[PDB]
């Protein structure tokens, strides 16, 4: 089971992003996948943890009500719903599980221009 | 502010849909939106409400863990995520608010052909 992370790019503040977190090798129907991101120099940190079938989906502080994790099980696929998009949400954004690498990652730039 | 549903369709069980509420003549950041469905010559139920800034979203008994609501500001549009979709979520889909009407809705068919 691998994931691949995609649909970072450029942003305003204000804006709105939604990454995608393709599955390979096995389904990810039943199994929480996390959200994490990093910024270079800096720690990275969680964002988002998706449901299960016992559990609801989380949300780290400084996301909560700004950000949404969704599935498409048909395209074995996790998302991450991105609005109200500030500068400090410029990082490179991972998915992962216990049990995948951290991933390439995708980038994220939230900008003045 | 008014709201129009769309993205129904026909799934097999098992199945993924994501459907739309595309809002007009305001903006929803701001604002609880609810999904709602209905099949004909049954009650009229309540499915989801979206997140504001001080509530997170709240699923139905039915579709907890199957469902997810979402939004992307940026297209002023509130989305219904479905998933592992069942032959009883068959019905006709509705969002609004208090402000708005229920709409013309939007047709999804759970069905095995």
């Known amino acids: 089971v691998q994931l691949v992370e995609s649909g970072g790019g450029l942003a305003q503040p204000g804006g709105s992003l939604r990454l995608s977190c393709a599955a390979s090798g096995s389904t990810i129907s039943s199994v929480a996948v996390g959200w994490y991101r990093q910024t270079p120099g800096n720690q990275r940190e969680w964002?988002?943890?998706?449901?299960?079938?016992?559990?609801?989906?989380?949300?780290?502080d400084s996301v909560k009500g700004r950000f949404t994790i969704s599935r498409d099980n048909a395209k074995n696929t996790i998302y991450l719903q991105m609005n109200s998009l500030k500068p400090e949400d410029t990082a490179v954004?991972?998915?992962?599980?216990?049990?995948?690498?951290?991933?390439?990652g995708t980038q994220v730039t939230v900008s003045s221009g | 502010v008014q709201l129009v549903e769309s993205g129904g369709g026909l799934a097999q069980p098992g199945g993924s849909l994501r459907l739309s509420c595309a809002a007009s003549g305001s903006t929803i950041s701001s604002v609880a939106v609810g999904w709602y469905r209905q099949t004909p010559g049954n009650q009229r139920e309540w499915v989801a409400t979206?997140?504001?800034?001080?509530?997170?979203?709240t699923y139905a008994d039915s579709v907890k863990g199957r469902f997810t609501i979402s939004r992307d500001n940026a297209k002023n549009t509130i989305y219904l995520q479905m998933n592992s979709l069942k032959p009883e979520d068959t019905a006709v889909y509705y969002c609004?608010?208090?402000?708005?009407?229920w709409g013309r809705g939007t047709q999804v068919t759970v069905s095995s052909g």
């Open positions: 979206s997140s504001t800034s001080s509530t997170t979203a």
């Open positions: 609004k608010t208090g402000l708005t009407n």
